[PDB]
Design a protein around this ligand. Sequence first.
Ligand SMILES: [Cl-]
Ligand SMILES: [Cl-]
Ligand SMILES: [Cl-]
Ligand SMILES: [Cl-]
Ligand SMILES: [K+]
Ligand SMILES: [Mg+2]
Ligand SMILES: [Mg+2]
Ligand SMILES: [Mg+2]
Ligand SMILES: [Mg+2]
Ligand SMILES: [Mg+2]
Ligand SMILES: [Mg+2]
Ligand SMILES: [Mg+2]
Ligand SMILES: [Mg+2]
Ligand SMILES: [Mg+2]
Ligand SMILES: [Mg+2]
Ligand SMILES: [Mg+2]
Ligand SMILES: [Mg+2]
Ligand SMILES: [Mg+2]
Ligand SMILES: [Mg+2]
Ligand SMILES: [Mg+2]
Ligand SMILES: [Mg+2]
Ligand SMILES: [Mg+2]
Ligand SMILES: [Mg+2]
Ligand SMILES: [Mg+2]
Ligand code: NA
Ligand code: NA
Ligand code: NA
Ligand code: NA
Ligand code: NA
Ligand code: NA
Ligand code: NA
Ligand code: NA
Ligand code: NA
Ligand code: NA
Ligand code: NA
Lengths: 237, 92, 194, 56
Amino acid sequence: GRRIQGQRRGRGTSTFRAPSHRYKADLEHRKVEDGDVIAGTVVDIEHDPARSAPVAAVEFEDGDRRLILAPEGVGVGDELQVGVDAEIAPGNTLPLAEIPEGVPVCNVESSPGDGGKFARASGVNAQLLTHDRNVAVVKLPSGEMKRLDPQCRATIGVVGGGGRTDKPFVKAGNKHHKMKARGTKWPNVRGVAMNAVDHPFGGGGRQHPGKPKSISRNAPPGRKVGDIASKRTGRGG
Amino acid sequence: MQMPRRFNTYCPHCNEHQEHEVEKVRSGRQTGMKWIDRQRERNSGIGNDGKFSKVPGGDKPTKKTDLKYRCGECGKAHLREGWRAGRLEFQE
Amino acid sequence: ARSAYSYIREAWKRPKEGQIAELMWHRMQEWRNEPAVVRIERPTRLDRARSLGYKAKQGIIVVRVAIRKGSSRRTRFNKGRRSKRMMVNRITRKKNIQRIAEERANRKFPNLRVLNSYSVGEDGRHKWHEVILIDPDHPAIKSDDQLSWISRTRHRLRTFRGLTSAGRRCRGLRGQGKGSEKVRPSLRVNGAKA
Amino acid sequence: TGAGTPSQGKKNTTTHTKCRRCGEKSYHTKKKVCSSCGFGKSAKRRDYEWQSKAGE
RNA sequence: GCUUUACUGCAGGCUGUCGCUGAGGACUCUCACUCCGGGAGGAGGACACCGAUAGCCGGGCA
RNA sequence: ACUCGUACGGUCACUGAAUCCUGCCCAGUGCAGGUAUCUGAACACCUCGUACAAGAGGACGAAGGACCUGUCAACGGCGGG
RNA sequence: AAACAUCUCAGUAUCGGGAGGAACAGAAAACGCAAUGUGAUGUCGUUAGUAACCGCGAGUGAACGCGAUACAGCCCAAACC
Ligand SMILES: [Cl-]
Ligand SMILES: [Cl-]
Ligand SMILES: [Cl-]
Ligand SMILES: [Cl-]
Ligand SMILES: [K+]
Ligand SMILES: [Mg+2]
Ligand SMILES: [Mg+2]
Ligand SMILES: [Mg+2]
Ligand SMILES: [Mg+2]
Ligand SMILES: [Mg+2]
Ligand SMILES: [Mg+2]
Ligand SMILES: [Mg+2]
Ligand SMILES: [Mg+2]
Ligand SMILES: [Mg+2]
Ligand SMILES: [Mg+2]
Ligand SMILES: [Mg+2]
Ligand SMILES: [Mg+2]
Ligand SMILES: [Mg+2]
Ligand SMILES: [Mg+2]
Ligand SMILES: [Mg+2]
Ligand SMILES: [Mg+2]
Ligand SMILES: [Mg+2]
Ligand SMILES: [Mg+2]
Ligand SMILES: [Mg+2]
Ligand code: NA
Ligand code: NA
Ligand code: NA
Ligand code: NA
Ligand code: NA
Ligand code: NA
Ligand code: NA
Ligand code: NA
Ligand code: NA
Ligand code: NA
Ligand code: NA
């Protein structure tokens, strides 16, 4: 047979790539020598094409102009601060250690300085639970408890644009326009709707997968489709 | 069928009739150093290994008699034609 | 009396022992941050180089080369192949790493010719060899009664034709008797059977 | 639409042009590579052994 | 061409073992090696990666 | 490559707007989890053997399997008397 | 090979790199007509479809020596300076 669609993806061709050249900025936390003195003002709120959410334009004291992952509640004129001594208000960035337990946070760094990795999508937020001199326990939106270096910087508040998922696309057309702003091939043809040659589920006089749909983790690419290493399926029980 | 464990009969070594003792040939064990063993190691490689990759044979519904005739006096054994027999039990 | 050199040699017989052991542990760290081909002012194994033909003279260059360890980096078949040839993992090239090194080095110095090469250790994935190269255009070498032979035109690109040290050994030309039926006077002339 | 005649009409593109190197009209002006002498890809000239019968 | 619990094999995944690899049937450390950091330094750490090999799965492919 | 992306994400699949609904079955097959015991390769280790070696055997035992459990909006099934 | 998997086609077709007018080889850690013997290397004739390989199938297949051609033998490293 032929490579299945998952295998074409890997190749990173035009069809599969994301319109990078159309993206605005790689939202990352600033780098501060130390002191925390670093502060800046919100100059404007712009739409981020890569995340379908708002992004804040900020002018820092030392002349630096950069876009920032804006939490809900940030407006023009506001003053944001970044550093160990930053005040504890929404929009400000400071290590998990300096953050008070029980406070919602977003755009968390996995390892100090990486610039933030966790909780950055629409309306999500992490939950700083436990402190320590060694470990900072944070609950990520997936519900997982993430043990982190209390040095990892994070932003106070919840990511802007919450509720996006509450409204249905309603029509293909609307998915279409969104999909075009992402690195994804759309629409999706069902395997079972293809020919044997094209997908392990293809073929037959009627549509139905050939074998069961749960596949082993060890399955090779080309065969790994359907329910991947599923721990269970269905709703019952 | 039944078969006496001992009985008189010609001994090709002694060259005269004497009491022989019958036993079922116990399968010897291999050294794994014969020529054929080396060829298998030597000749097997990437892909199908030819003969050494073959599918196992079958079995006849009944096997022939596989015995040893041990001479009671000179102690030297001798082999005979076997004959199909579903089962062979010695008497005493 | 033992030459000072004889010590350099003695030490390298067991490159994982004593002082040289700690030297490698030290060097390799710098080596792993170095390039594929780095010229070096002096041979790490003086005895070795000199023994091979080295001389602290004008027109003689030495360079350390890093080659990946292991079997051949091979791409699986994209068309019909009988089992025997569906091979990928266990296939190994017929040219030893040292010889690859010699070539890589030589290409980096297009005007120079390979004289000989030697090993200088290896970590978990690299293998380093030092190659001695010669400028067949620099007098002093043209005028050296012990190397001027490499200036001859007949020697243009010795490595690429396997006229090297490891070249001839790799071509199975070591023995003069039994075993070299398909080796001498050349693999190609023997229909490529060794 | 037929892939034949009716699809012949749109062919007003220029591709293979006179090669500055070998003079054949095979210099692909979009690729800046000659399909005949390899100019633009190889310093050495394009040549293969299958261009002639094996024993000749 | 296609399929599969047809035959034989081949990639790939998992796993044990060896080399890189070091100090004092469970354990600490740091020096290789790896990642994070502009740097200072931080995390990890003899594992991982990579090289070799062994067992299992293996129409993804021949 | 996805990704100037970070679970309100994105990948992989099934079904195919709305409305009323979506029962019973984990034996087989698949996937996943656990596992006293059993099975389970090679290196290193022990025994025999060989002034060495081939080789025979033992001890230890990973993933896997046996075995147990979960799971059908997983493949599928929902009869005779 | 009257299928076909080792085997064969074949180290062939084809691909990458490179020299010369010829290339390559070459002065024994050789041979081993076992010798009180030969004496760098190619090549030609023969040894020989011999020995050896091989679902011991089909097929595959040398060497020493001998007769010829042409002959040619040297330089470092180190010891001591
Ligand atoms: Cl979406
Ligand atoms: Cl019997
Ligand atoms: Cl060269
Ligand atoms: Cl002789
Ligand atoms: K074939
Ligand atoms: Mg980024
Ligand atoms: Mg949805
Ligand atoms: Mg609308
Ligand atoms: Mg697109
Ligand atoms: Mg669809
Ligand atoms: Mg169809
Ligand atoms: Mg298929
Ligand atoms: Mg349907
Ligand atoms: Mg269906
Ligand atoms: Mg094999
Ligand atoms: Mg057409
Ligand atoms: Mg990095
Ligand atoms: Mg097939
Ligand atoms: Mg439909
Ligand atoms: Mg045939
Ligand atoms: Mg020749
Ligand atoms: Mg036959
Ligand atoms: Mg042959
Ligand atoms: Mg001989
Ligand atoms: Na189907
Ligand atoms: Na062999
Ligand atoms: Na050169
Ligand atoms: Na060979
Ligand atoms: Na077909
Ligand atoms: Na079941
Ligand atoms: Na089940
Ligand atoms: Na035939
Ligand atoms: Na056929
Ligand atoms: Na064969
Ligand atoms: Na004679």
